[PDB]
């Protein structure tokens, strides 16, 4: 099975989102559930992103102000600005990290049902707005090739 891109369908992106969120929550000891080198590379890339981010900025959750009524709009506003002038793998990693932060903060703030919603919002945004860019730019395979190496 080497003729086509790894994780080349929306169903695969969904799995990718669910595994990512499960991991981000597990790092905080919160248990939740709803391509293998792809999941591994994204874990690594997001962790390395977070490390760099935190060197320069305060905790990402310090500027969120989550409520159940405003969470979807907060998500959409942030992500729409993130990709307003374009897409690249670094911004896609930023997208996963932001979604993970939304989920962690939801559980922290005793709004844990929002996790399931955030996972759906991420999956939909990925499939509606990032997936065709991903296919046009070498698939998750290209991402693995570029971000596979540490740092």
């Amino acid at each position: 099975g080497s003729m086509a891109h790894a994780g080349r369908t929306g169903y695969d992106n969904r799995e990718i989102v669910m595994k990512y969120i499960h991991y981000k929550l597990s790092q905080r000891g919160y248990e939740w559930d709803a391509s293998e080198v792809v999941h591994l590379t994204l874990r690594q890339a997001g962790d390395d992103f977070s490390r760099r981010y935190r060197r320069d900025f305060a905790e990402m959750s310090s500027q969120l102000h989550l409520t159940p009524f405003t969470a979807r709009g907060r998500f959409a506003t942030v992500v729409e600005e993130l990709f307003r002038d374009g897409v690249n793998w670094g911004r896609i990693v930023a997208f996963f990290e932001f979604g993970g932060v939304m989920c962690v903060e939801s559980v922290n703030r005793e709004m844990s049902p929002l996790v399931d919603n955030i996972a759906l919002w991420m999956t939909e945004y990925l499939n509606r707005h990032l997936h065709t860019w991903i296919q046009d730019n070498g698939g998750w395979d290209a991402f693995v090739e570029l971000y596979g190496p540490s740092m």
Binding site: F49, R52, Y53, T77, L82, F98, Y147
Partner: peptide
Amino acid sequence: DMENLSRRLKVTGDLFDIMSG
């Protein structure tokens, strides 16, 4: 705060992009 958050995500994202290449 939301605008600033997005900008922080975007630039850190762009940095990462550039380092990979």
